Amino acid sequence: MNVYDDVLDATVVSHSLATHFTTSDYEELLVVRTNILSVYRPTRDGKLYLTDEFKFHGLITDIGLIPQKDSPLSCLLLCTGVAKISILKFNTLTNSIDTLSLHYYEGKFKGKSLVELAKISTLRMDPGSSCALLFNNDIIAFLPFHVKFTAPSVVLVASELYEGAKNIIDIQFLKNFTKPTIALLYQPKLVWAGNTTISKLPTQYVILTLNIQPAESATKIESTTIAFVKELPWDLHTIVPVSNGAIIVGTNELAFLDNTGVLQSTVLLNSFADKKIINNSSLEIMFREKNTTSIWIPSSKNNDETLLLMDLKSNIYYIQMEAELLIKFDIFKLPIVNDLLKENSNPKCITRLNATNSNKNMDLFIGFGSGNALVLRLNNLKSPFDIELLSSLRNVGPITSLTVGKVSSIDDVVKGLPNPNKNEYSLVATSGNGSGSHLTVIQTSVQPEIELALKFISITQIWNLKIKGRDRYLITTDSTKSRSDIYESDNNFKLHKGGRLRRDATTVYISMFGEEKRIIQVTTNHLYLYDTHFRRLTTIKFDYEVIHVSVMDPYILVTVSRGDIKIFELEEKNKRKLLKVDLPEILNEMVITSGLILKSNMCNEFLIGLSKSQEEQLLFTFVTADNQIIFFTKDHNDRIFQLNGVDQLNESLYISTYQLVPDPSIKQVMINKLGHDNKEEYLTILTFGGEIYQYRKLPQRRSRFYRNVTRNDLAITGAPDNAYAKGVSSIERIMHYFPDYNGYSVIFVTGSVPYILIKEDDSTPKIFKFGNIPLVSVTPWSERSVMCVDDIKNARVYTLTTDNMYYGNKLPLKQIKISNVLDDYKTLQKLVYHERAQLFLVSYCKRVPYEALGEDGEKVIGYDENVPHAEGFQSGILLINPKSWKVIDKIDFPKNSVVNEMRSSMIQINSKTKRKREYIIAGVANATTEDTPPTGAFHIYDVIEVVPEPKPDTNYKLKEIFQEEVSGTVSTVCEVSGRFMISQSQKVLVRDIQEDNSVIPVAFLDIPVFVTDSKSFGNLLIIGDAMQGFQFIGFDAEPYRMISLGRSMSKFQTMSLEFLVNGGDMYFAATDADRNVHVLKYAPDEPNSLSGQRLVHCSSFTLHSTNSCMMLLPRNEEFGVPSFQNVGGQVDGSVFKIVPLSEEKYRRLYVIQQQIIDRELQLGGLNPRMERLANDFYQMGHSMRPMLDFNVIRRFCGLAIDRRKSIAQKAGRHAHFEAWRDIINIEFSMRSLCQGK
Amino acid sequence: MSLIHPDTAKYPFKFEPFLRQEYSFSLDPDRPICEFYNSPKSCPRGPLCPKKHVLPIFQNKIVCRHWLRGLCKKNDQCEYLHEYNLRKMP
Amino acid sequence: IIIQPSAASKHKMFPFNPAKIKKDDYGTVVDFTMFLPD
Amino acid sequence: TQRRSVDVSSPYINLYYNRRHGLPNLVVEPETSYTIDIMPPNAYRGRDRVINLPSKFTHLSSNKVKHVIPAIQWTPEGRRLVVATYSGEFSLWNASSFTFETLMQAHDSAVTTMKYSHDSDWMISGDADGMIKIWQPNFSMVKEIDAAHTESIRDMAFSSNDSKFVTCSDDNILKIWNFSNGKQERVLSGHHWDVKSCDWHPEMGLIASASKDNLVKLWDPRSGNCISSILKFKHTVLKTRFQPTKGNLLMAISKDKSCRVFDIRYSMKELMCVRDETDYMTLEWHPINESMFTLACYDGSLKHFDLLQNLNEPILTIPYAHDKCITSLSYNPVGHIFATAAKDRTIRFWTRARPIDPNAYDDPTYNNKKINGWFFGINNDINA
C-alpha cells in the first residue's frame, strides 16, 4: 500500500538530436533527460527556448530519425526499456505526438539467447533511411523501411549473417553504399587485461551487404560479406563510421578500417599498448568507458570532414582524415583555456545545433552526467581555436546524499520583522561527481529576499502608485472600519494630511490613469477621478457597490453587485469626462462573475481588417457563471467571441463565436506574457477551489490554446468540489500579475499559502509555494520588486533571488558551491545536519592515484612507475555553517580511506538518567584491493561552542570523542537506541557510550557478504547485503543481543534501505542495481513466512535510474500515530518519495490508476504497468497490490470535469471528493518541512 | 516533534506480542529487570510481561569461544555466556 | 510487429498480461510434455 | 604473522561507490594499480565475464590427518568451506585466510555429499551407509534420519523453496522428502542401474538424474513418474547439473568421455558434445555467469568451457591442476574463489586472474615443477 511520486524531475541529459520534428521552419533540438523528451529552439546566440516538453512512462534508451514520404517532418524512433522500438510522429493538427507502429523485440531476443540479455539494447540507423537494427547482444533485430505501410515486418538473426560473428562488441551501418551495409566488431575469444598474455589480437571485423527483401508475410535478408579482418587489438569497443570507412575507437588504439575492410593506420594513445602503420603518441589518454561519445560531421557544399571524440573527464579530441589511400591519420587534443568543462564529467551525447553551411564556427549541444548540459560554440578548427558557453541546462548531477536541515528559517527575525519562512526546513542534497560537486538545496517554498520590513501600514489591502515610477502614494484601506489612508512612500508617511481622497469608505481599487496624468479611485459605492496633485475632478455615483475593477489606459471596467457591466472611457482631449462605452445586448442577458480588460492577438484572424500576428487587440474579457470565457473588442459590432472548451477545461482551446446551468468554478482568468527572456502568452485560470490551470498559445495559429496532460509540471494547489477547503477559506486567493519581478514575468497568488508562478526560458511555467507566512495583498514596488502584507499587518518588500536559483524542475533548486577557487573538495557525499548546533556536516572524497601496497610497508611487485595508475580515495569531514555556507573546520583522513557513512546520532550517554548528546559518527573504510585484509576506522565527534575568530560563525569546532581503527572495512553506521552500530567485514558491532568517552562493543552479528546500507527504527535494524537482499535485526539492551528477525526471500544487490512503516504494520523499502524498488514487510503471522524469518516480498517497482540514498521523513497530514515517508535521490538527478497509503486510499488510487491506463491514451504507446512491473521480480509479489505511480494518477487532474467525474465512478460513490482529497494529501506530503521545531 | 531525529523509539507495531512471545524481545530495550523470573512460569504476568525476562544462558560469567566463531553446537544449553562483552573474555 | 490504426483506445499500447506462473513448494508447475527429447 | 587474505569487501566498496555516483565500471588495464578497479564477480556480465575465470592458483590446503576427501562444499554465503573426510568429519576452512583445523566428527561412515539450503539456514549431509543428517548453520543436530537409503548416498539437492529435497544413492531409486520433518514422500521408481547423480531445477519443479543405465532421466517432483529420458550417452552418466541461476541448461558427463549440454527450452535441444581422451569426473557451473562451467578430468586437467565462445573446445585448460584425479569442484557463492579437491588428499583454491602477474598461465599447476603455494607473502602476484 504505497505510492511513488517524483519530487524532482530528471535533469541529466542522456540523448540529443536535431531534426524537423514539431515544425519545419527551424532546426529543432530534442533532449531526453531520462523519460522526458524536450523540444528546444536553439536561438542565434545559443540560448535554448523550450517549445514543447513530453514525459514518457519508461526510460528512453535511444532515439532515432526516419523521414516520411511527402512530408518535411521526420518521424521519431523511440527506443525504451529492453528491446523496444516505437515510431513517433507529430500531429500538428492536435500539436501532440502520436504512435505509428510498435515493435517488441524482447521476447524474440530471449527466445534465442543462451544467457541473460543486456540491460539496454542499442539502436543503429543507416545513413540511407532504409532500415534500422536494434541489437542487444549477439542478436540483431532488423526494422526495414519502405522507399502503403511505412515499415515491413521485423526479422532478427543472431549470427546467420556471418558464421564468424560470436561475441559482438559493436554494430554500425556504413556510409556510401547503395545497399544497407553494416560493420561488425566481435571477439570470438574474449580477452581482458589478464588474458592479454595468452591470446593475441582476438578482435575481428567484417562488413556485410544486406539484401533487404521485405514481403507481405515476413522479411528475409541475404547477407553478402564485403570484406573481413582477422587480427585486431583486444581493447577495441567503438565503431565510428565515416565517409570512406570507419574508425575503431579502442581503449588504447584507434584503428582506421575503410569500406574495403583493410586496416590502414593505427594510432597509439597511452603507454599501455604495444604490437601496420602505427602512429605513436605519448599523450596519456584513455577511453576506459565501454562507449565513447563522438560527433561525426560530413563535409560542406569543398572537403572538410571532422570527427570529435570525447573523454570521461570531458575532453574533446580531434581526428583528422585526408585522402587522395588515406594519409595523415592522427589524433589531436583541442584545449580549454577557461576550463569551463571542469565541472562537467561523463558526457553522454553530442549534437550540432546550427548548420552554418560549414564545419567551422560550430554549435555543439553536449549532455553530461555530472555537470550541467552545455551548448558550446567552436569557432575555428585547426590541427585561432576557442570555446565559449552559450547556454546551460541545470543538472543537479547524481544526488548522492540527502538530509533535512535549516537553510532558510535560520534567523528568527529578519530586518526587524519575523522571518517570512520561519520554522521551515529544506531538503539539502549533494550533487555531482568531482570538481563540480556542490550542495543542492531543494526548497519546499520560494524564499524571498528582504529589502524593507516596515510595520503596520496596511489593514486589508494596499495599492502602490507610480507618478513617474517613483513609488508615491501607497494607498491602504480598511475593509472592516470602512476607512482608507493615503500615506507617502517617499520617506514621508504620516498620511498626506489631506488630499481630497474619500478616506471614509472601503477603497476597492485605485491606480494611475490616462498616461499617469490622472488618478482614479473606485470606493465601495463611488467612483472618483483625481489628478497627480490629487484634486478631485469627476465623481460617478454607483447606486450598487462595486466588486471588481479593471483598468487599462483608455478604459476602466466596473462590475457591481447585480453584475451590471459598466465600461467608461477617458476623454483624450481634456479628460474629466469618462464617457460610457457601448456593450453588446447579450451582455445584459448573461450573468458575469468576474471581468478584466485584456490585450491579445488571439482574435486577429476573425476581426475584420487585420490578419497579422502583431498588434494585439484590446479585449473586454468576462467570465460567466457557466465557466465560459467571452471577450470583444472596442468596435465590437456586437460580435462576441469565446474560448471554446474552458467550461469543461479541455486539453485544447480555440477562438469561436459565442452561442447562448450556472456552476461558477472559474474565479479569475489572466492572459499575459510569462517567462524570463522569452515571454509567451499564457491563459491562467483560478478556480474557487484554489487550483490553477494554465494554457499555452502557439505562436503559429494564435487563435488556439493547448495544454499538456502527459507532462506533469503544474503543481496541484486546490481541488474543484470544495475539497481542500482550508486553502481558500481563510484568505481570499487573488492572482496578481507582475511583468517584472526580477526580470521574470510572474503571477502572485495570495492566500494563507501564497503561490508564485515562474517560467524559465528552458522550462514550462511552475507553481511554487511562496514563503511560509500568509499573504493578503501584493503590489508592485520600485522596479523589479513587490511589497507583501501578511495577516498580522506586517509589511515586507520582496525581491526574487536569481544568483544560484533555478525555478524549473517542479521545486526551486538552490546551488550551494562549497568548493571555491582556493580549495577544491571534489565530490561531496554523506551530508548531515547537526540539529543542536544548527550546522551542516559533509564529507569530501578527493580522488588520488592508487598505490597497491602489501600488508607490510612495501608495495606489490607488479607496480609500474612509468605508467598511469587507477584512482584511489582520500576523504574527510567538513563543518559548514548554513548561515554563511562556509567551511568552519576540516579534518583530514589518511590515504585510501573513504567515508562510507556519516550520521549525526542521538547517543544515550547514561543508562540510568537516559541523557543523550548528538555526536557525529563517521564510518571510514580503507579502499584497497582484494589481496589485502580489510581495515577501517570509526570516529565519534562532538560539536562544542568555541570563541570565534576576531570572523563570525566560526564559534563551532569539531572535537573528537572517540577514535579507533578496526579490522574490516566500515561500510555503514547506524545508531540503535542510543548505541551506535557499525559494520565490519561480514560483521556488525554495537558499542555503548559512557561519560568518560569509553567505547566498548556489547553485541555483534554476522552478515553474508557486504553491508550496503543500514537503518534503525528504535531498536530494530535492517542491514542490506550486496548479494542476498537484506535482513531484519532486533537489539535488546540489558543482555545485549542481535536477534535475527528475518531475511528477504529474494536475493538482489540492494543499494539503499529505509522503513516504510505505514501505520500498525511495518515495511522495508529496498533498491537494487537493476533500478527496482522492492517493498517487503516483516509478517510473522502468515503460514508461509516461517514465523517471521522470511520477509514477504510485496511489490517490485522499476525506477528509471539507480537509487543512491534513502531517508525517513515525517508526513504532513493535511486532514488527519506519527506518519513517515521515504525520500530517495537518483543518479539521473531526480528525487522520489514513497508515501505509504491506507487501505481505502490505496483502493481508490489503484482504481483511478487502472482507469487512467485503460480509458486514457499514453504518450508513445508505453504501458506503465509494463514499464514498471515487467522486471525479474514480477512473479514474486502481490499481483493486485503494486506500487502506485503518482505520475499516472497526476493525469487524473488533467482530464475534463465530466471525464474526471466519470473516472471516479469506477469504485466508490463520492470517490471524486476523497480522490481529490488524498491526491492533495500526497502532493502536500513533504510540507512537514514547513513546520519544524 | 523533530524532523531531523524523528521519535521512533516507542511506536505501536502490531508484531510486538509476537516479538515478546518468541526471542523474549521488547520494543523498549532499556526496560527494568522483571525481578520475578527464576532460572518458566515464575513470572506472575507470564511471557507477555513488559518487564524483561532473562534466559539462564545470559547469567554465565565466561563468553563462549564457539559462539564467537558462530560454531556453538549448544544453542541455549551452553554453560558459557552467549553475549559479547569484552570485560569477561577468557 | 504492431501497426497502429486509429480505432481503439487501449490497443495503441504495448500489451502486458503475463500469465500468473503457478508455483508450489516443489517449484513452478509447468507443462511436462515440452521436455520430450523428440 | 601476516597471512594471505582474499576478501571481497573493498571491491564491493569500490563497486557501490561507482554505482551510487553513476560512474561507469572502468576497463581494467594491465597494471597492478588497476586491481582496485577489478569489480566483484557479481558485477561482471556479458562480454567481461572472462574476468570471472578462476585461472589463478592461490592456496593449497590439507588437514593434519591426510584422509581422502569425498566432497567439498562452501557455506551458503561463502564464509567457510566444509570439507568432508573419510572418517565422517566436517573440516571447516575460512575463506578469507584459508586456514583452519576444525574437525567435527559429523557422521560415522564416510560423508559423500553435503548440500546447503537456498535460504542459507540449513544443511543436509549424506554418508556411506545411507544416513542423512540435517544441520544448522552453527553445525548442530536438527534431524538424523537413519537408513534413508540402503547403500551410500551419492547426491542430493534442495528445491527452490527449500521445503523439499531429492536424494540419490548407489541404488536405482530416487526419493523425495518433506524438509520440515524429513517425512518419506513419493519414491521416483524407475531407472535400471545405480543412479549416480541428481539435481533440482532452480525455479521449476523438475528432477534430473544420471545412472549407469546410459540414460539421463527427467522426473516429476509431484507426479513421481519419469516425464522424459535422454538417450545420448554410451556409458554410465557420472553427473548432471542444471544451470544454478536460470536453469535453462542441463549438463551431463558420461564414462564415454563426452560432455553434453541440453537446452530444456526447446525439447532437450543439445548444444554441445565435447569428447575428450581422458575421463570426465565431475562438473560445476559458474555461480554467476551462465554458459560458463568447469570440467574435472581423471588426470587433473581442469577445463573451463564457454557456450558463447566455443562449442567444441574449452576456453581455458589447466592441464595439471591436481596431481591425481579431481573428485570435487566447489565455487564460492560470491564467485571470487574456486575450490578443487582430488584423490591426492589435497584441497586447492583458485581465484580470478590479476591484470599482470609473472606466473600467469605458467606455474606448477599449468606445468610440472614441484608444487607450492607460497604461504609467506603479502600479495597475490608473485615475482618470477
Length of chain A: 1237
**Residues D104 and D89 sit within 8 Å (Cβ to Cβ):** yes
The answer to whether A408 touches A838, Cβ cutoff 8 Å, is no
Identify the burial level of A1123 via C-beta atoms within 10 angstroms of its C-beta, where 0-12 means exposed, 13-18 middle and 19 or more buried: middle
Distance of alpha carbon A1140 from alpha carbon A1146, whole angstroms: 9
Please tell me which of the candidates B5, B11, B86 has its beta carbon nearest to residue A1018: B11
DSSP-derived pairing of the beta strands A203-214 and A219-232: antiparallel
Contact C2 A103 (CB under 8 A): yes
Q: C-chain residues within 8 Å CB-CB of A149?
A: 3
Residues 6+ apart with CB under 8 A from A29: A16, A17, A18, A39, A40, A41, A42, A48, A351, A353, A365
The count of residues in chain B is 90
Total count of residues recorded for chain D: 384
Q: Helices A1215-1227 and A1201-1208: crossing angle, nearest 10°?
A: 100
Q: Are D265 and D248 a contacting pair, CB within 8 Å? A: yes
Question: Which triple of cell numbers denotes residue A536?
Answer: 478631485
Long-range contacts, A1063-1069 (Cβ 8 Å, 24+): A1063/A1121, A1063/A1123, A1063/A1140, A1063/A1142, A1064/A1121, A1064/B12, A1064/B13, A1064/B14, A1065/B14, A1066/A1017, A1066/B13, A1066/B15, A1067/A2, A1067/A1098, A1067/A1140, A1068/A1022, A1068/A1030, A1068/A1032, A1068/A1095, A1069/A2, A1069/A1110, A1069/A1126, A1069/A1138
Angstrom distance (rounded) from CA A503 to CA D293: 95
B-proximal residues of D, 123-162, CB under 8 Å? 137-141
Q: Are chains C and B in contact at 3+ CB pairs closer than 8 Å?
A: no
Query: What is the rounded distance in angstroms from the CA atom of residue D199 to the CA atom of residue D252?
Result: 11
Q: Cell digits for A172?
A: 554500425
> Domains of chain B by range and CATH?
14-54 (no CATH), 59-90 (4.10.1000.10)
- The answer, for C31 touching chain D at a CB cutoff of 8 Å, is no
Tell me the C-alpha distance between D92 and D98, whole Å: 10
Q: How far is B29 from chain A (nearest CA, A)?
A: 5
d(CA A325, CA A331): 18
- Spatial CB neighbours of D119, under 8 Å, sequence gap ≥ 6: A1047, A1049, A1094, D162
Segment (H or E) for A1154: helix A1143-1159
| Beta-carbon separation of A1179 and C13 below 8 A | no
Of A1227, A975, A1021, give the one whose Cα is nearest residue A1125: A1227
D9-351 is classed in which CATH architecture?
7 Propeller (2.130)
Candidates A835, A1037, A1122; nearest CB to B5? A835
C-alpha to C-alpha distance for A166 and A595, rounded to whole angstroms: 73
Kindly write down the DSSP assignment for every residue of D227-238, as one continuous string: -EEE---SS-EE
- How far apart, in Å, are the Cα atoms of D147 and each of D130, D131, D172? 5, 5, 15
| A974 closest CA partner among A1128, A829, A1083, A1112 | A1112
Helix, strand, or coil (residue A592): strand
What letter represents residue A50's amino acid?
L
Assign 3-class secondary structure to A1157-1178. Answer: HHHCCCCCCCCHHHHHCCCCCH
Q: Are A35 and A1189 in contact (CB under 8 A)?
A: no
Bridge partner list, A982: A973, A989
The residue with cell 552467549 is B82
In the chain, the amino acid numbered A948 is P
DSSP assignment of chain B, as one string?
--SSS---SS---TTHHHHHHSTT--S-SSPPB-SS-------TT-SS-SSBP--GGGG-SSB-HHHHTT--S-SS--SSB-S--GGG--
Helix (H) or strand (E) run with residue A1202 in it: helix A1201-1208
Residue matched to cell numbers 579490522: A967
Determine the Cα–Cα distance for residues A832 and A843; give it in Å rounded to an integer.
9
Residue in this structure with the C-alpha cell 513421481, named with its chain if needed: D224
Residue type, position A794, single letter? N
| Sheet order of strands, D80-84 included | D72-74, D80-84, D90-94
Sheet holding A36-42, edge to edge: A15-19, A28-32, A36-42, A48-55
Cα A399 to Cα A397: distance, rounded to the nearest angstrom: 6
Judge contact between A1059 and A1018, C-beta under 8 A.
no
Q: Which chains have at least 3 CB atom pairs separated by less than 8 Å from chain B?
A: A, D
Parse chain D into domains and list their residue ranges.
9-351
Residues 6+ apart with CB under 8 A from A1014: A901, A972, A973, A974, A981, A983, A988, A1021, A1022, A1023, A1024, A1057
Are A346 and A369 within 8 A, CB to CB?
yes
Q: How many CB atoms lie within 10 A of CB A45?
A: 9
The three grid cell numbers given for residue A847, joined into one nine-digit string:
580522488
Method: cryo-EM
User: Is B71 in CB contact (< 8 Å) with chain A?
Assistant: no
- β-bridge mates for residue A172, sequence order: A183
Torsion of CA A938, A942, A943, A947, to 10 degrees: -120
C-alpha cell at A347: 558526457
Of A867, A872, A971, the CB nearest to D31: A867
What resolution (Å)?
Answer: 2.8
With H, G, I as helix, E, B as strand and everything else as coil, classify residue A106.
Answer: helix
Question: A1201-1208 and A1143-1159 helices cross at what angle (nearest 10)?
Answer: 120
Report helix, strand or coil for A374.
Answer: strand
State how far Cα A231 lies from the chain centre: 47
Cβ A1158–C18 below 8 Å, yes or no? no
Cell of A611: 490578419
Torsion over CA: A833, A837, A838, A844 (sign): negative
- For A222-249, b where at least 16 C-beta lie within 10 A, e where not — what string? ebeebeebeebbbbbbbbbbbbbbbbbb
Phi, psi of A33 (to 5 degrees): -85, -70
Judge: B70–D102 Cβ closer than 8 Å, yes or no: no
Task: Report which of A291, A297, A303, A387 is spatially closest to residue A348, judged by C-alpha positions.
Answer: A291
CA distance linking residue D132 with residue D118, whole number of Å: 18
Quick check: A582 and A635 in contact, CB under 8 A? no
d(CA D41, CA D3): 23
DSSP β-ladder status, A1124-1130 and A1135-1140? antiparallel
- Angstrom distance (rounded) from CA A1230 to CA B6: 15
Residue numbers in B near D89 (CB within 8 A): none
The whole-angstrom separation of Cα A738 and Cα A778 is 10
Q: In whole angstroms, give the CA distance from residue D218 to residue A1166.
A: 41
Size of interface A-D (CB pairs under 8 A): 266
CA atoms of A1221 and A718, how far apart (whole Å): 9
Instruction: Report CA dihedral (A12, A17, A21, A23) to the nearest 10 degrees.
Output: 90
Closest CA to A237 of A224, A223, A250: A250
- Residues in chain A with CB shorter than 8 Å from the CB of D336 are 930
Query: Which has the closest alpha carbon to A523: A507, A544, A537?
Result: A507
Strand, helix or coil for residue A30: strand
Judge: D102–B71 Cβ closer than 8 Å, yes or no. Answer: yes
Q: Report the DSSP beta bridge partners of residue A308.
A: A295, A318
Q: Count CB atoms within 10 A of the CB of residue A422.
A: 20
Residues 6+ apart with CB under 8 A from A348: A12, A13, A14, A15, A293, A367, A368, A369
CA distance A1030 to A1018: 18
